[PDB]
């Protein structure tokens, strides 16, 4: 009957492409009065709690730390960008609830992000991380990729 | 002589980190063990450097005084040993063990 938005967990998403690394930190917000609404079916309630809304808090790329052009897709750019994220999560008091890490692709920043989180740079965030997962998007047939490059 | 050997055995570092130019990338700082002859060289050079800060014109006198102070506990080269062992403890994981 009253909006009671509360954070349930945080999602640390990393997209590691060939030319850049994108790191997004989000909050899984749950209106704790959703079940108190009128005209709400058991299906709508279960469907609302199975995909809870998400709000973006921190969005970073390797170009936000001053890495330009070809340097954006390198290992060092990702390692420093991962550090800046782990710091901004502590400077925003967003290290109280559990964090779920979602990694997307297999560029050079995937192993830098993992090293920065299992090392000194991520000794505070790693303590809250409860689940790691991969979200690489593959196609079963799908659209035709571009032709092979003749180099 | 027993005092000299005891001082050399306490001042010399057991291990020392060395940079190996392995690979086109940055060299690796890996702790390496030292033999007794290599340990004595490191400790002796520290003693000589400390001795040459004393006032006597005669090297034998400066060396004698330096060795007496080390046999009595006081020496500025124990700091050097602690700093070489700190670095090695930091790079303990860099060791290969095969």
């Amino acid at each position: 009957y009253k909006p009671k938005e509360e954070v349930v967990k945080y999602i640390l998403h990393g997209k590691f492409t060939k030319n850049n690394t994108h790191l997004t930190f989000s909050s899984v917000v749950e209106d704790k009065n959703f079940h108190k609404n009128k005209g709400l079916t058991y299906n709508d309630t279960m469907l609302y709690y199975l995909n809870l809304p998400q709000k973006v808090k921190i969005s970073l790329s390797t170009g936000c730390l001053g890495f330009r052009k070809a340097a954006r897709g390198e290992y060092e750019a990702a390692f420093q960008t991962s550090g800046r994220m782990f710091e901004l999560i502590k400077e925003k008091n967003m290290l109280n609830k559990d964090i779920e890490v979602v990694m997307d692709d297999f560029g050079k920043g995937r192993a830098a992000f993992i090293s920065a989180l299992v090392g000194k740079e991520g000794a505070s965030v790693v303590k809250k991380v409860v689940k790691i997962s991969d979200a690489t998007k593959l196609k079963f047939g799908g659209v035709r990729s571009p032709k092979m490059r003749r180099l | 002589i027993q005092a000299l050997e005891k001082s050399l055995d306490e001042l010399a570092p057991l291990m020392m980190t060395k940079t190996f130019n392995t690979g086109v990338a940055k060299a690796s700082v890996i702790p390496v063990p030292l033999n007794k002859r290599q340990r004595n060289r490191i400790a002796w050079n520290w003693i000589v450097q400390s001795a040459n800060q004393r006032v006597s014109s005669d090297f034998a006198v400066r060396l004698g005084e330096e060795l007496t102070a080390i046999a009595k506990g006081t020496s500025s080269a124990f700091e050097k040993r602690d700093q070489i062992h700190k670095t090695a403890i930091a790079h303990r994981a860099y060791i290969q063990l095969k």
Binding site: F106, V118, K127, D134, L138, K139, M148, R149 | -
Partner: protein, 92 residues
């Protein structure tokens, strides 16, 4: 109602994808190693790379034939090495 509140735990994990690991709070680097093993046993990195550029069907068929031959050839090679080692052990 609460019926839709107390039955969300299983429901949440009932629609799993199989690409998730529960982190070991003690050794968090061992959980990332487990996730990497899943990726390699489902050929996720290989499939992603193979989907970047289009390959003609004839070329795809050629590569599939050669890869199978090399896989089978290696199995035949290991069988012969095992015979060698067994024969050596018995003094042949």
């Amino acid at each position: 109602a609460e019926i839709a509140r107390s039955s969300v735990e299983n429901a949440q994990m009932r629609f799993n994808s199989g690409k998730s690991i529960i982190v070991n709070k003690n050794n968090p680097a061992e959980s990332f190693k487990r996730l990497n093993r899943i990726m390699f046993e489902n050929n996720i990195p290989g499939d992603k790379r193979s989907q970047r550029f289009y390959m003609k069907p004839g070329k795809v068929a050629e590569l599939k034939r050669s890869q199978r031959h090399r896989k089978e050839f290696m199995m035949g090679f290991k069988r012969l090495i095992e015979i060698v080692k067994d024969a050596k052990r018995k003094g042949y």
